[PDB]
Structures are given as structure tokens and as C-alpha cells.
Amino acid sequence: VDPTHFEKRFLKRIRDLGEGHFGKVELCRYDPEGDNTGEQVAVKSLKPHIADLKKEIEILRNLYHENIVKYKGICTGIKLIMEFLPSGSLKEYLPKNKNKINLKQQLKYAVQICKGMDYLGSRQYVHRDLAARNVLVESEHQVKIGDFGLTKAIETDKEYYTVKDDRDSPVFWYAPECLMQSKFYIASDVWSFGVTLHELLTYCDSDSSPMALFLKMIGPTHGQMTVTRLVNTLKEGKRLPCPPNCPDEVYQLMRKCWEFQPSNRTSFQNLIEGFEALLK
Ligand SMILES: COc1cc2[nH]ncc2cc1-c1[nH]ncc1NC(=O)c1cnn2cccnc12
């Protein structure tokens, strides 16, 4: 018996956790005894991309970090089995838990996301989808990167992966090089982290989301010209505003994520040092 091979007949669906465009995550109980005593697991499957899910499974199987969701196995068509984190995504958790989470805890979550991302970068991978909706809450003290659906390998001595299909792109979290040439560097993930940090600091408020704020900056009636207008505004040096009640020193670290050139752009190691200095 392979402990990473889950039989479909014992995988009992409890409820949906969330869904994207092509995939969904469900809470299941892996119950081989048939008495509802088995382990609860999160199960990722595609909506009725198969090649892309198989590649994602192999990436997650080889990632081992305290701030990266734990791979548990597969159910072979294929389903990805992972550990279940009851508090859900940061996007759902933060609006309901503002009383429990203060600035100090937000900065500790920030460090933890940087550590998981720095580990991913060390394994030569680029995430391409770093947003609060992809960060999971293990407890009020810990977060983990919880999805690798768009993750791609960066070639040795190369700075980037060349994206062919831009159709599932979160453009309001994307660096200018991603928008203009679909060039994905580890530096492009640092840009997206800065956007995720803005979300975390606003408690993932929908009205102050990166999409809502950029649309107010560029105008919301540009239709197919929207990304072009977003590129123009970023070239002008305009950036997302400072979250209410966010100290200028934290906003300054955020601004360093948004240096136009993917060179004036810092590393995750550099950001960790910044946040730790603010925590002491
Ligand atoms: C990262 O969250 C998601 C990832 C996705 N991919 N496709 C759909 C999709 C949906 C979610 C999602 N949207 N709202 C909550 C969640 N996820 C969880 O509650 C969850 C708990 N443990 N767990 C383990 C692995 C992945 N997800 C989880």
C-alpha cells in the first residue's frame, strides 16, 4: 500500500471550498473504514488543463517548506490530495477576523509568504499567480502558499519562462514586463507579492481591492484598452495608494516591490530583512 495513493471509492465529498475558472477545491474525508472517522483532506480537481494539473502535482510533490501547503498524494484523469487548512484563504479569512489580526501579525504573515516564495525561487520556479486568494491560513499565527496552478520552471542561467497562454492572468497583480511581453522572472513574483501585501494590509477589503483601485486610477470604461491604460499608468510612475493605517515604512517596502525594471527590483531575502527589522 502506497500512503500517497488515495482510492476514489473512499474519497467522500463534504463541501466545496472554492473554485476558479477551470479547477475547484473540495473538502473530503478519506474514509476506508466507512464510518466517518477518516482524515479530512483538500482535493483539487478540474471542472468537467489535464497536462497542466499533472505538472502542478509533480511540482507540489517536491516542495517541502513550513509555508507551502503539504502535498498528501493523488487519486488517479487525476485529483491532487493535500492537507486541509480549516481557516481557508486569506481573502475569506481576513474580513471575518480583523479583531484577531493586528499590524504585527500582518507583518509576520508577510514574512511567511516571502519565505515560502524565496524557497519556490530557489527551486527555479516562478509562481505567476501570487494573490491573497492563493494564500491559506493554517492558524492565526501561520500562513502557507496554497496553490501552484500557474507555476512554471525557469531555465538555468535564464532569468525567465516564456508564457504562451495569457488567458488565466490576474493582470492587476502583474508586473509591467508580464503585461508587455509575458516575460515571467522571479522578480515578476516580487511585484505580485507587493500587490498581495497591499491586500493583506487592507484586510482583503473588496471595495479597496487592487482591481477596484487601479480602475479608479485609469478609468473603468476602456474595455479592451484596459491593460494598455494600466501599462501607461505604471510607466508614468503611478502605483497603488498607501493602505489606510499602514505605516510609511511598510509602504516603502511595498514600493520597492514595484520598481519598474525587474532589476531595481529586490529579492524576497531582501524583503524578509526589511520586515524583521520592523518587528524588532
Ligand atoms: C488556495 O485556495 C484555493 C485554491 C484553488 N484552486 N482552484 C480552486 C481553488 C480554491 C481555493 C480556495 N478558495 N477559498 C478557499 C480555498 N481553499 C481552502 O479553503 C483550502 C483548505 N485547505 N486547502 C488545501 C489546498 C488548497 N485549498 C485549501
Side-chain angles (χ1 to χ4, degrees), residues 1-156 158 160-163 165-182 184-279:
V1 55
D2 188 324
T4 72
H5 290 170
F6 290 77
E7 306 268 69
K8 175 65 190 178
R9 66 189 146 112
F10 305 139
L11 203 60
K12 303 300 167 194
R13 181 185 175 278
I14 301 176
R15 57 180 177 90
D16 277 4
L17 293 180
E19 66 175 6
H21 191 197
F22 300 97
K24 81 181 296 188
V25 174
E26 294 169 313
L27 170 55
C28 297
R29 192 180 288 279
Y30 188 62
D31 206 40
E33 290 183 84
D35 67 341
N36 307 296
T37 66
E39 197 180 12
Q40 282 187 318
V41 291
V43 178
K44 186 171 181 186
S45 60
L46 294 163
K47 289 182 174 193
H49 306 276
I50 296 142
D52 290 344
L53 179 60
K54 284 178 191 173
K55 275 190 185 172
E56 179 186 346
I57 288 163
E58 195 52 19
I59 291 159
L60 193 61
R61 190 180 79 79
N62 293 281
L63 297 175
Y64 301 98
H65 186 276
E66 58 185 313
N67 301 121
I68 290 185
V69 69
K70 284 186 187 169
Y71 164 92
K72 281 184 95 71
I74 55 167
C75 173
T76 57
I78 198 165
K79 295 163 186 291
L80 166 53
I81 315 304
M82 291 165 288
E83 59 170 343
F84 171 55
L85 269 62
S87 289
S89 80
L90 255 197
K91 187 168 164 199
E92 300 164 345
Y93 180 88
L94 286 173
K96 297 161 80 176
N97 292 273
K98 298 180 188 79
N99 193 232
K100 263 185 227 208
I101 312 304
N102 65 9
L103 177 61
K104 190 153 197 188
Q105 191 56 74
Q106 290 173 306
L107 296 182
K108 283 184 196 173
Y109 285 166
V111 169
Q112 289 164 25
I113 294 159
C114 286
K115 287 177 169 164
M117 287 302 293
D118 193 37
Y119 172 91
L120 187 68
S122 79
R123 299 292 297 268
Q124 283 179 88
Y125 288 108
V126 73
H127 189 273
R128 302 178 42 224
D129 203 30
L130 178 58
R133 63 181 156 88
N134 288 324
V135 178
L136 298 171
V137 178
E138 165 62 30
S139 68
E140 76 168 75
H141 308 293
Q142 188 184 343
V143 291
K144 299 194 186 193
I145 306 155
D147 190 89
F148 295 86
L150 294 188
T151 299
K152 297 287 189 178
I154 289 188
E155 207 192 287
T156 303
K158 281 201 184 169
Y160 64 103
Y161 168 84
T162 36
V163 171
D165 190 351
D166 303 322
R167 285 175 299 182
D168 294 295
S169 294
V171 299
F172 295 110
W173 276 253
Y174 269 11
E177 63 279 5
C178 308
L179 299 172
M180 301 182 281
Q181 300 181 285
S182 302
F184 288 83
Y185 294 66
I186 287 169
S188 305
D189 279 339
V190 174
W191 176 289
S192 303
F193 166 76
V195 184
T196 302
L197 175 60
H198 192 286
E199 288 185 276
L200 161 61
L201 289 164
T202 71
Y203 294 99
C204 289
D205 171 64
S206 286
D207 296 341
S208 320
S209 73
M211 176 167 75
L213 299 172
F214 273 119
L215 291 174
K216 290 192 276 182
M217 284 175 244
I218 72 174
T221 62
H222 298 296
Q224 279 185 287
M225 319 323 293
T226 298
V227 164
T228 301
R229 294 298 199 105
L230 174 61
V231 176
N232 293 344
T233 322
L234 297 170
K235 282 180 171 178
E236 282 157 35
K238 303 210 199 297
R239 297 295 186 269
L240 283 169
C242 182
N245 314 303
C246 168
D248 193 63
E249 45 262 73
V250 177
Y251 186 58
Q252 285 318 305
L253 277 175
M254 201 190 288
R255 292 290 286 248
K256 298 183 184 178
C257 293
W258 305 324
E259 275 289 320
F260 194 94
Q261 294 295 148
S263 77
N264 291 114
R265 239 179 279 148
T266 177
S267 62
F268 283 115
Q269 194 47 239
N270 199 240
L271 282 158
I272 287 157
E273 289 176 26
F275 293 120
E276 285 179 332
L278 291 176
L279 291 160

Short mmCIF file of all heavy atoms in Angstrom, two decimals, residues 15-26 41-45 56 60 69-70 82-92 132-137 144-149, ligand 1:
data_model
loop_
_atom_site.label_atom_id
_atom_site.label_comp_id
_atom_site.label_asym_id
_atom_site.label_seq_id
_atom_site.Cartn_x
_atom_site.Cartn_y
_atom_site.Cartn_z
N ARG A 15 -17.90 19.21 1.22
CA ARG A 15 -18.37 20.52 0.71
C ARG A 15 -17.33 21.14 -0.20
O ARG A 15 -16.16 20.74 -0.15
CB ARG A 15 -18.69 21.49 1.88
CG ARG A 15 -17.56 21.77 2.86
CD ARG A 15 -18.00 22.74 3.96
NE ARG A 15 -16.93 22.97 4.95
CZ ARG A 15 -16.01 23.93 4.85
NH1 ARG A 15 -16.05 24.79 3.83
NH2 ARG A 15 -15.08 24.06 5.78
N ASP A 16 -17.75 22.13 -1.00
CA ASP A 16 -16.85 22.92 -1.83
C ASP A 16 -16.07 23.84 -0.93
O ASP A 16 -16.59 24.30 0.10
CB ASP A 16 -17.65 23.81 -2.79
CG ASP A 16 -18.15 23.18 -4.05
OD1 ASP A 16 -17.94 21.95 -4.21
OD2 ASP A 16 -18.74 23.90 -4.87
N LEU A 17 -14.82 24.14 -1.31
CA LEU A 17 -14.00 25.12 -0.59
C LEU A 17 -13.89 26.38 -1.41
O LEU A 17 -14.01 27.47 -0.86
CB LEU A 17 -12.61 24.58 -0.20
CG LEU A 17 -12.63 23.47 0.84
CD1 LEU A 17 -11.23 23.00 1.16
CD2 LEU A 17 -13.38 23.89 2.11
N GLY A 18 -13.68 26.22 -2.71
CA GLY A 18 -13.58 27.31 -3.67
C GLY A 18 -13.40 26.83 -5.09
O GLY A 18 -13.05 25.66 -5.35
N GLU A 19 -13.64 27.73 -6.04
CA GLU A 19 -13.46 27.41 -7.43
C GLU A 19 -12.88 28.56 -8.20
O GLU A 19 -13.14 29.72 -7.88
CB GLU A 19 -14.74 26.85 -8.10
CG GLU A 19 -15.89 27.84 -8.22
CD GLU A 19 -17.12 27.37 -8.98
OE1 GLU A 19 -17.19 26.17 -9.35
OE2 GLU A 19 -18.04 28.20 -9.19
N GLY A 20 -12.10 28.21 -9.20
CA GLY A 20 -11.52 29.11 -10.17
C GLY A 20 -12.24 28.87 -11.48
O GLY A 20 -13.34 28.30 -11.49
N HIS A 21 -11.63 29.28 -12.60
CA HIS A 21 -12.21 29.12 -13.92
C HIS A 21 -12.23 27.65 -14.37
O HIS A 21 -13.29 27.19 -14.80
CB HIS A 21 -11.50 30.03 -14.95
CG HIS A 21 -12.18 30.12 -16.29
ND1 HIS A 21 -11.50 30.60 -17.40
CD2 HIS A 21 -13.45 29.82 -16.65
CE1 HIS A 21 -12.37 30.56 -18.40
NE2 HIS A 21 -13.55 30.09 -18.00
N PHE A 22 -11.10 26.92 -14.25
CA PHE A 22 -11.01 25.52 -14.69
C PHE A 22 -10.92 24.47 -13.57
O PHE A 22 -11.07 23.29 -13.84
CB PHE A 22 -9.84 25.32 -15.67
CG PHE A 22 -9.97 26.17 -16.92
CD1 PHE A 22 -9.30 27.39 -17.02
CD2 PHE A 22 -10.80 25.78 -17.96
CE1 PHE A 22 -9.44 28.19 -18.16
CE2 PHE A 22 -10.95 26.59 -19.09
CZ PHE A 22 -10.27 27.79 -19.18
N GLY A 23 -10.63 24.90 -12.35
CA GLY A 23 -10.50 23.95 -11.25
C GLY A 23 -11.31 24.27 -10.03
O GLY A 23 -11.86 25.37 -9.90
N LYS A 24 -11.37 23.31 -9.10
CA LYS A 24 -12.07 23.54 -7.85
C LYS A 24 -11.38 22.75 -6.76
O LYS A 24 -10.69 21.75 -7.04
CB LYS A 24 -13.56 23.16 -7.96
CG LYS A 24 -13.88 21.68 -7.84
CD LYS A 24 -15.37 21.37 -7.98
CE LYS A 24 -16.23 21.96 -6.89
NZ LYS A 24 -17.63 21.49 -6.97
N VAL A 25 -11.56 23.21 -5.53
CA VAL A 25 -11.02 22.53 -4.36
C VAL A 25 -12.20 22.15 -3.46
O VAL A 25 -13.02 23.01 -3.13
CB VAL A 25 -9.96 23.39 -3.62
CG1 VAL A 25 -9.50 22.72 -2.31
CG2 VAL A 25 -8.76 23.62 -4.52
N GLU A 26 -12.24 20.89 -3.04
CA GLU A 26 -13.31 20.40 -2.17
C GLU A 26 -12.75 19.82 -0.89
O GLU A 26 -11.65 19.25 -0.89
CB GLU A 26 -14.07 19.29 -2.90
CG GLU A 26 -14.84 19.78 -4.11
CD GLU A 26 -15.39 18.71 -5.02
OE1 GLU A 26 -14.64 17.76 -5.37
OE2 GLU A 26 -16.57 18.83 -5.43
N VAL A 41 -9.21 15.93 4.05
CA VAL A 41 -8.19 16.32 3.06
C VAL A 41 -8.77 17.35 2.09
O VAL A 41 -9.98 17.33 1.86
CB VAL A 41 -7.61 15.12 2.24
CG1 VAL A 41 -6.75 14.20 3.10
CG2 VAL A 41 -8.70 14.35 1.48
N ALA A 42 -7.92 18.21 1.49
CA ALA A 42 -8.40 19.13 0.45
C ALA A 42 -8.08 18.43 -0.87
O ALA A 42 -6.99 17.89 -1.03
CB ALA A 42 -7.69 20.48 0.52
N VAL A 43 -9.04 18.44 -1.81
CA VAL A 43 -8.91 17.74 -3.08
C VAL A 43 -9.09 18.72 -4.24
O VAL A 43 -10.15 19.34 -4.39
CB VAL A 43 -9.94 16.56 -3.17
CG1 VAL A 43 -9.87 15.83 -4.53
CG2 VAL A 43 -9.78 15.58 -2.00
N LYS A 44 -8.04 18.85 -5.07
CA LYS A 44 -8.09 19.72 -6.23
C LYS A 44 -8.37 18.88 -7.47
O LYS A 44 -7.66 17.91 -7.75
CB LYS A 44 -6.80 20.55 -6.42
CG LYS A 44 -6.93 21.55 -7.57
CD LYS A 44 -5.74 22.52 -7.64
CE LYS A 44 -5.93 23.49 -8.78
NZ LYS A 44 -4.73 24.36 -8.99
N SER A 45 -9.41 19.27 -8.21
CA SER A 45 -9.74 18.57 -9.45
C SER A 45 -10.19 19.59 -10.52
O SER A 45 -10.53 20.72 -10.19
CB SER A 45 -10.83 17.52 -9.20
OG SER A 45 -12.00 18.15 -8.71
N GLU A 56 1.63 20.34 -12.22
CA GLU A 56 1.44 21.05 -10.94
C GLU A 56 1.61 20.07 -9.76
O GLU A 56 2.25 20.40 -8.76
CB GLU A 56 0.04 21.63 -10.98
CG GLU A 56 -0.37 22.39 -9.75
CD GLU A 56 -1.83 22.78 -9.84
OE1 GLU A 56 -2.42 22.68 -10.94
OE2 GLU A 56 -2.38 23.18 -8.80
N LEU A 60 4.36 20.31 -6.71
CA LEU A 60 3.99 20.30 -5.29
C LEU A 60 4.55 19.09 -4.51
O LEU A 60 4.97 19.25 -3.36
CB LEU A 60 2.46 20.41 -5.09
CG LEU A 60 2.04 20.71 -3.64
CD1 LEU A 60 2.60 22.06 -3.13
CD2 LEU A 60 0.53 20.62 -3.49
N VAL A 69 1.78 24.63 1.32
CA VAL A 69 0.76 23.59 1.64
C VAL A 69 1.33 22.18 1.37
O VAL A 69 2.01 21.98 0.36
CB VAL A 69 -0.58 23.85 0.92
CG1 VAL A 69 -0.48 23.63 -0.60
CG2 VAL A 69 -1.72 23.00 1.53
N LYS A 70 1.07 21.26 2.28
CA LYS A 70 1.61 19.89 2.18
C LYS A 70 0.87 19.04 1.19
O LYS A 70 -0.35 18.84 1.29
CB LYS A 70 1.59 19.19 3.55
CG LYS A 70 2.67 19.66 4.52
CD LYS A 70 2.69 18.83 5.80
CE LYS A 70 3.66 19.40 6.82
NZ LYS A 70 3.49 18.75 8.15
N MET A 82 -4.27 17.14 -0.82
CA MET A 82 -3.43 17.98 0.03
C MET A 82 -3.96 18.03 1.45
O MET A 82 -5.13 17.66 1.71
CB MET A 82 -3.41 19.42 -0.53
CG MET A 82 -2.68 19.58 -1.87
SD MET A 82 -3.04 21.16 -2.73
CE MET A 82 -4.77 20.87 -3.30
N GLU A 83 -3.15 18.56 2.37
CA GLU A 83 -3.63 18.73 3.75
C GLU A 83 -4.77 19.76 3.76
O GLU A 83 -4.81 20.66 2.91
CB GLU A 83 -2.51 19.14 4.70
CG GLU A 83 -1.85 20.43 4.29
CD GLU A 83 -0.88 21.03 5.28
OE1 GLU A 83 -0.91 20.65 6.48
OE2 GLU A 83 -0.10 21.91 4.85
N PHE A 84 -5.71 19.61 4.70
CA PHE A 84 -6.84 20.53 4.80
C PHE A 84 -6.56 21.60 5.83
O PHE A 84 -6.29 21.28 7.00
CB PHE A 84 -8.13 19.76 5.17
CG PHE A 84 -9.31 20.65 5.51
CD1 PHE A 84 -9.75 21.63 4.62
CD2 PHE A 84 -10.01 20.47 6.70
CE1 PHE A 84 -10.84 22.45 4.95
CE2 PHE A 84 -11.11 21.27 7.01
CZ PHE A 84 -11.51 22.26 6.13
N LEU A 85 -6.69 22.88 5.43
CA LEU A 85 -6.50 24.02 6.35
C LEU A 85 -7.85 24.66 6.61
O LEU A 85 -8.37 25.34 5.73
CB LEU A 85 -5.46 25.02 5.77
CG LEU A 85 -4.01 24.78 6.18
CD1 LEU A 85 -3.48 23.45 5.70
CD2 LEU A 85 -3.10 25.87 5.63
N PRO A 86 -8.47 24.39 7.79
CA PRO A 86 -9.85 24.84 8.05
C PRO A 86 -10.16 26.33 7.96
O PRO A 86 -11.32 26.68 7.69
CB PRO A 86 -10.11 24.35 9.49
CG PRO A 86 -9.24 23.15 9.63
CD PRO A 86 -7.98 23.54 8.91
N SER A 87 -9.16 27.20 8.16
CA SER A 87 -9.44 28.64 8.11
C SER A 87 -9.53 29.26 6.70
O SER A 87 -9.87 30.44 6.56
CB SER A 87 -8.46 29.41 8.99
OG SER A 87 -8.78 29.11 10.33
N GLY A 88 -9.29 28.45 5.67
CA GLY A 88 -9.48 28.85 4.28
C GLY A 88 -8.47 29.84 3.74
O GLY A 88 -7.35 29.92 4.26
N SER A 89 -8.87 30.60 2.71
CA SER A 89 -7.91 31.55 2.12
C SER A 89 -7.80 32.83 2.93
O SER A 89 -8.74 33.17 3.64
CB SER A 89 -8.25 31.85 0.67
OG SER A 89 -9.29 32.81 0.57
N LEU A 90 -6.70 33.60 2.74
CA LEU A 90 -6.54 34.90 3.41
C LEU A 90 -7.65 35.83 2.96
O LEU A 90 -8.14 36.62 3.76
CB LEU A 90 -5.22 35.55 2.96
CG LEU A 90 -4.03 35.57 3.88
CD1 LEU A 90 -3.03 36.63 3.39
CD2 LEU A 90 -4.41 35.83 5.36
N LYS A 91 -8.08 35.68 1.69
CA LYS A 91 -9.11 36.52 1.08
C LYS A 91 -10.45 36.41 1.81
O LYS A 91 -11.10 37.43 2.00
CB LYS A 91 -9.24 36.24 -0.43
CG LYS A 91 -10.18 37.21 -1.15
CD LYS A 91 -10.06 37.09 -2.65
CE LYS A 91 -11.22 37.74 -3.38
NZ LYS A 91 -11.32 37.24 -4.79
N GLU A 92 -10.80 35.21 2.28
CA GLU A 92 -12.01 34.92 3.04
C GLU A 92 -11.80 35.15 4.55
O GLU A 92 -12.69 35.67 5.23
CB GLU A 92 -12.42 33.45 2.81
CG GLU A 92 -12.71 33.13 1.35
CD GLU A 92 -12.73 31.66 1.00
OE1 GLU A 92 -12.26 30.82 1.81
OE2 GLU A 92 -13.22 31.35 -0.11
N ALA A 132 -3.75 37.10 -2.51
CA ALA A 132 -4.28 36.65 -1.24
C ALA A 132 -5.23 35.46 -1.35
O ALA A 132 -5.26 34.63 -0.44
CB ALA A 132 -4.96 37.79 -0.51
N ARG A 133 -5.92 35.31 -2.48
CA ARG A 133 -6.85 34.20 -2.72
C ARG A 133 -6.11 32.84 -2.81
O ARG A 133 -6.74 31.79 -2.65
CB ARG A 133 -7.71 34.43 -3.98
CG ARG A 133 -6.90 34.50 -5.28
CD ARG A 133 -7.72 34.74 -6.54
NE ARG A 133 -6.83 35.33 -7.54
CZ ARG A 133 -6.07 34.66 -8.40
NH1 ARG A 133 -6.16 33.33 -8.49
NH2 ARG A 133 -5.24 35.30 -9.21
N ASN A 134 -4.78 32.89 -3.03
CA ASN A 134 -3.92 31.69 -3.08
C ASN A 134 -3.10 31.43 -1.82
O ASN A 134 -2.34 30.46 -1.77
CB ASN A 134 -3.00 31.73 -4.30
CG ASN A 134 -3.74 31.51 -5.57
OD1 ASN A 134 -4.74 30.65 -5.53
ND2 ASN A 134 -3.44 32.13 -6.59
N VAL A 135 -3.28 32.27 -0.78
CA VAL A 135 -2.59 32.08 0.49
C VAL A 135 -3.62 31.48 1.47
O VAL A 135 -4.74 31.98 1.57
CB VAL A 135 -1.99 33.39 1.04
CG1 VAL A 135 -1.31 33.19 2.41
CG2 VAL A 135 -1.00 34.00 0.03
N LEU A 136 -3.25 30.42 2.16
CA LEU A 136 -4.11 29.73 3.13
C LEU A 136 -3.71 30.03 4.55
O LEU A 136 -2.53 30.24 4.85
CB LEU A 136 -4.07 28.20 2.92
CG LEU A 136 -4.57 27.69 1.58
CD1 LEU A 136 -4.25 26.17 1.44
CD2 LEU A 136 -6.08 27.93 1.41
N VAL A 137 -4.68 29.97 5.45
CA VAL A 137 -4.47 30.26 6.86
C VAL A 137 -4.44 28.96 7.64
O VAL A 137 -5.46 28.26 7.69
CB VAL A 137 -5.59 31.19 7.37
CG1 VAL A 137 -5.41 31.47 8.87
CG2 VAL A 137 -5.64 32.49 6.58
N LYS A 144 0.30 29.69 4.60
CA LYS A 144 1.01 28.84 3.63
C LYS A 144 0.54 29.21 2.20
O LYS A 144 -0.64 29.47 2.01
CB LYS A 144 0.69 27.35 3.88
CG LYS A 144 1.08 26.80 5.26
CD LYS A 144 1.04 25.30 5.29
CE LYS A 144 1.28 24.81 6.70
NZ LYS A 144 1.55 23.35 6.70
N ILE A 145 1.46 29.14 1.21
CA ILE A 145 1.11 29.29 -0.21
C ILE A 145 0.35 28.01 -0.55
O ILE A 145 0.84 26.90 -0.28
CB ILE A 145 2.33 29.57 -1.11
CG1 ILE A 145 3.12 30.80 -0.58
CG2 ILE A 145 1.84 29.82 -2.57
CD1 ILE A 145 4.51 30.79 -0.96
N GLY A 146 -0.88 28.18 -1.02
CA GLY A 146 -1.82 27.08 -1.15
C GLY A 146 -2.23 26.58 -2.51
O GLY A 146 -3.09 25.71 -2.57
N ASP A 147 -1.65 27.13 -3.59
CA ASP A 147 -1.99 26.75 -4.97
C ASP A 147 -0.84 27.03 -5.90
O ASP A 147 -0.17 28.04 -5.73
CB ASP A 147 -3.26 27.50 -5.45
CG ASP A 147 -3.80 26.96 -6.75
OD1 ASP A 147 -4.63 26.02 -6.71
OD2 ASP A 147 -3.37 27.45 -7.81
N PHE A 148 -0.60 26.14 -6.88
CA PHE A 148 0.55 26.26 -7.81
C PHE A 148 0.09 26.02 -9.24
O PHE A 148 0.88 25.57 -10.08
CB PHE A 148 1.68 25.27 -7.38
CG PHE A 148 2.25 25.63 -6.02
CD1 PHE A 148 1.65 25.17 -4.85
CD2 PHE A 148 3.31 26.52 -5.91
CE1 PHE A 148 2.09 25.61 -3.59
CE2 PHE A 148 3.78 26.93 -4.66
CZ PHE A 148 3.17 26.47 -3.51
N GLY A 149 -1.19 26.32 -9.50
CA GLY A 149 -1.85 26.11 -10.79
C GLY A 149 -1.19 26.72 -12.02
O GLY A 149 -1.36 26.20 -13.13
C1 LIG B 1 -5.76 28.22 -2.20
O1 LIG B 1 -7.19 28.06 -2.15
C2 LIG B 1 -7.83 27.62 -3.28
C3 LIG B 1 -7.16 27.18 -4.42
C4 LIG B 1 -7.87 26.82 -5.56
N1 LIG B 1 -7.51 26.37 -6.79
N2 LIG B 1 -8.60 26.11 -7.57
C5 LIG B 1 -9.65 26.41 -6.84
C6 LIG B 1 -9.28 26.87 -5.55
C7 LIG B 1 -9.94 27.29 -4.39
C8 LIG B 1 -9.23 27.68 -3.25
C9 LIG B 1 -9.99 28.19 -2.08
N3 LIG B 1 -10.81 29.25 -2.19
N4 LIG B 1 -11.29 29.51 -0.95
C10 LIG B 1 -10.82 28.67 -0.03
C11 LIG B 1 -9.95 27.78 -0.74
N5 LIG B 1 -9.14 26.72 -0.23
C12 LIG B 1 -9.26 26.18 1.03
O2 LIG B 1 -10.11 26.53 1.85
C13 LIG B 1 -8.29 25.12 1.36
C14 LIG B 1 -8.07 24.49 2.60
N6 LIG B 1 -7.07 23.62 2.56
N7 LIG B 1 -6.62 23.67 1.27
C15 LIG B 1 -5.54 22.99 0.76
C16 LIG B 1 -5.21 23.23 -0.53
C17 LIG B 1 -5.98 24.16 -1.27
N8 LIG B 1 -7.03 24.82 -0.79
C18 LIG B 1 -7.34 24.56 0.51
#
